[PDB]
From a paper:
Inteins (intervening proteins) are protein domains inserted into host proteins that are found in all domains of life. They remove themselves out of their precursor proteins in an autocatalytic process called protein splicing, in which the flanking N‐ and C‐terminal exteins are ligated to form the mature host protein. The more recently discovered and less well‐studied class 3 inteins, by contrast, form an internally branched intermediate in the first step of the pathway. The internal motif C2 : 4 cysteine performs a nucleophilic attack at the N‐scissile bond to give the branched thioester intermediate.
To increase the chances of capturing the intein with active site residues in relevant conformations for splicing we decided to crystallize the precursor and fused the AceL NrdHF fragments with inactivating C124A and N146A mutations. Five native flanking extein residues were included at the N‐ and C‐terminal sides, respectively. Expression of the fused intein domain in E. coli without the inactivating mutations resulted in quantitative splicing with no detectable precursor protein remaining, thus suggesting that the artificial cis‐arrangement did not have an impact on folding and function. We determined the structure of the AceL NrdHF precursor at a resolution of 1.9 Å. The intein adopted the typical HINT fold with the expected localization of the conserved motifs in and around the active site. The asymmetric unit contained two protein chains that form an inter‐chain antiparallel β‐sheet involving residues A12–K15 and come in close proximity at residues E140–G142. Electron density can be observed only for the two N‐ and two C‐terminally flanking residues in chain A as well as two N‐ and three C‐terminal extein residues in chain B, suggesting that extein residues further outside were disordered. All intein residues showed electron density including the three residues (GSH) that were inserted upon fusion of the IntN and IntC fragments. Cys124, in the structure mutated to alanine, was indeed located in the active site at the expected position within the motif C2 motif to allow interactions with both splice junctions and to act as the branch point residue. The distance of the thiol side chain to the carbonyl carbon of the N‐scissile bond would be only 3.0 Å, sufficiently short to trigger the initial N−S acyl transfer without additional larger conformation changes. Our crystal structure shows the M70 side chain centrally located in the hydrophobic core as expected.
Author numbering: -1 to 151
The structure:
Amino acid sequence: DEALLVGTKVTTKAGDKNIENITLEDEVLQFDMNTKDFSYTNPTKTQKVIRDEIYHFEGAGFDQKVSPNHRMIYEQGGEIKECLAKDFEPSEDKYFIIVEGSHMQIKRIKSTDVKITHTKLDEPTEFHALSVPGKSFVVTDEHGNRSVTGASM
């Protein structure tokens, strides 16, 4: 429902762990939406759901494959905002959050540089979700790029 495609890697203190393998005992790199600070915290819940539609955001080192009602996290003005994937409308003033290198350096890319595909999948597949106190956490795509994505509330 508010989930990420199976095999999405979640950045933890130890490395980049397949989301379907995350437990409540893992130390996940969260991003606090109120403070913009990075920290490792335990997820308070994990979710497994099977769906057949996906929103694929792709551009400029940003790649997320999410459920329709997954919370997308972006910066606008000086504030960190959320929007459901199916509702997100790119604009020059809304920026997705990339985390570059080993020092957790924030790079903000224009959402208008990110293509959005809404796909009906040929067959159902598993999507997974985490809840963390900061309400967002860092995922790593197939090309080693890290970005901030919404947690389930």
